[PDB]
């Protein structure tokens, strides 16, 4: 029923809380000092024992993680109703912002390199039986070659879906969801109960591979309902409209494969990205 910060392998004396880093749908995310840190303050119902040991469920799984492509989970003190998840602070910019700045060149060699980094980290999380469930370019950080995944596992305890028989759909969420997930979104959908999987995470990587080369999300033109139906029945773009070769386009056909068992694991995907020009 309680998590203390003395329970962690990172010796902790004091924790300073600075300015808000940015807006976001899941709690608030402040600058902090410990070394410099990133603090995410989440609030929970006072007496929802289910949500809580299901949070505790998650965090000490994270206590076993350390990998150069995965943000360093540092600690999580929990004196309900106020929670906190404390991780290393990322220098540099998010992949979302880098992709959408015209002053940065993103040649085919660089995009292969960024993608292999994300894959290595995702393979580590998968190897430890941890699903990301929200892999996307706002959750990847890029500082002159250094690439770091963040926010893995949070989506289960997130509550970002929460109107009357109306599901709230953020821009760019849907085009990451593999078809098995899209086909059951409903106004009763709970983040706890969607069928995420290792295969769903590979799909979400595919969306990032599209985004690295087109420098925008797929289905940019289209409204949410059109995206749901188009992705549910298996319709997907290629990148020949911008002169990308076959190899780059084949990556998508594998990652976005309609039947899950046809998409590669991250280990196989790591090989496929090696054999590019």
């Amino acid at each position: 029923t309680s998590i203390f910060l003395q329970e962690w392998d990172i010796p902790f004396e004091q924790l300073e809380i600075g300015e808000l880093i940015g807006k976001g749908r899941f709690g608030q995310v402040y600058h902090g000092r410990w070394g410099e840190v990133a603090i995410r303050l989440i609030d929970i119902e006072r007496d929802n024992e289910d949500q809580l040991k299901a949070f505790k469920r998650e965090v000490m799984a994270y206590r076993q993680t350390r990998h150069e492509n995965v943000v360093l989970f540092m600690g999580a003190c929990m004196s309900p109703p106020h929670l906190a998840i404390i991780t290393s602070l990322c220098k540099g910019r998010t992949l979302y912002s880098v992709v959408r700045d015209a002053k940065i060149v993103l040649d085919v060699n660089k995009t292969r390199q960024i993608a292999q980094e994300i894959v290595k980290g995702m393979g580590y999380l998968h190897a430890k039986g941890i699903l990301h469930k929200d892999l996307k370019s706002k959750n990847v950080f890029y500082d002159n070659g250094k690439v770091v995944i963040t926010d893995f596992g949070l989506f289960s305890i997130s509550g970002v879906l929460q109107r009357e028989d109306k599901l709230r759909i953020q821009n760019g969420w849907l085009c990451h969801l593999a078809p098995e997930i899209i086909r059951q979104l409903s106004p009763d959908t709970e983040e706890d109960k969607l069928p995420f999987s290792k295969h769903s995470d590979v799909f979400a990587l595919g969306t990032i591979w599209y985004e690295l080369h087109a420098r925008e999300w797929p289905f940019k033109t289209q409204p949410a309902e059109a995206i749901i139906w188009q992705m549910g029945t298996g319709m997907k773009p290629n990148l020949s409209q911008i002169g990308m070769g076959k190899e780059i386009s084949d990556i998508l056909l594998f990652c976005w494969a309609f039947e899950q068992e046809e998409r590669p694991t991250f280990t196989k995907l790591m090989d496929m990205l090696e054999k590019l020009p």
Partner: protein
């Protein structure tokens, strides 16, 4: 496309035009909620409705949305609601409008049981003239026709609202709301090129819903049709695309009405009736030349 008793109040709208000048927040005092609010302007005693669209977004883009929005001062007709001004205050752009005493036709439907054919006769002309006006006078299609965006008043006018003026405002709102009642045309869900034909389908679907008192997909089983007189988003949209369209029950509605909705709900947008094909249709030429006190029907059913 002309009448003198509606040239009367178009122009008396442009006399309350001068009274507004420019607008920002503290001019307005909230009265009640209807998200949009009932407001009371202070420099000008006009009672309006104020939209709130929460957007969290750049310098240059706002200026170019509000100036893209300024097209609504120009458009004027008895089948489109009244536009006053657009400004930005506190992370939320706010469109101020003509207020409507009766509410949306979704509003009136849930209070009534069903809506009679003779009234939705007149509703149909209001929509078809509106869409015809906007296309050939401004080269814009509505893009979002549904019962909640057709508004009515105790004076007796029916006009459309919440249509697409600003190609950017579409792009800038961060998240949409997807429920169990969809009015998107089958061609729009598949990502095919579309025209005002899509707005005609949206009209057809709204009409059958209002005539029956229930959203018509999936269609009801014989047990619920007798009475009247758990589904995931994807399979509803897939129903719209692959199963045959809904139709009114053969018993209780006239042939002219049934053929009207049937032509609006044809899947192939080329075979679907176009705007003015619909205006020479038997059902609305019959309905045009009828006397129904719309104001009286409204005030007796919602109570005002």
């Amino acid at each position: 496309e002309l009448d003198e008793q509606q040239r009367k109040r178009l122009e008396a709208f442009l006399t309350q035009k001068q009274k507004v000048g420019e607008l920002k927040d503290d001019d307005f005092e909230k009265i009640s909620e209807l998200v949009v609010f009932k407001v009371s302007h202070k420099p000008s005693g006009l009672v309006m409705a104020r939209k709130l669209i929460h957007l969290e977004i750049k310098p240059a883009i706002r200026n170019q949305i509000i100036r893209e929005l300024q097209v609504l001062h120009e458009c004027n007709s008895p089948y489109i609601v009244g536009f006053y001004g657009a400004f930005y205050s506190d992370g939320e752009i706010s469109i101020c409008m003509e207020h409507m005493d009766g509410g949306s036709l979704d509003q009136v439907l849930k209070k009534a049981g069903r809506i009679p054919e003779q009234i939705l006769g007149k509703v149909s002309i209001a929509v078809i003239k509106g869409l015809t006006y906007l296309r050939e006078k401004h080269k814009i299609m509505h893009r979002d026709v549904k019962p909640s965006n057709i508004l009515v008043n105790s004076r007796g006018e029916i006009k459309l609202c919440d249509f697409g003026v600003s190609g950017q405002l579409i792009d800038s709102m961060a998240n949409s709301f997807v429920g169990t009642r969809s009015y998107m045309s089958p061609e729009r869900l598949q990502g095919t090129h579309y025209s005002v034909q899509s707005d005609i389908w949206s009209m057809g679907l709204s009409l059958v819903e209002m005539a029956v008192g229930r959203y018509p997909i999936p269609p009801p089983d014989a047990k619920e049709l007798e009475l009247m007189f758990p589904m995931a988003i994807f399979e509803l949209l897939d129903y719209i695309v692959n199963e045959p369209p809904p139709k009114l029950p053969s018993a209780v509605f006239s042939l002219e009405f049934q053929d009207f909705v049937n032509k609006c709900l044809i899947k192939n947008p080329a075979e679907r009736a176009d705007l003015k094909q619909l205006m020479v249709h038997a059902f609305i030429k019959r309905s045009d030349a009828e006397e129904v006190d719309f104001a009286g029907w409204l005030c007796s059913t919602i109570g005002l």
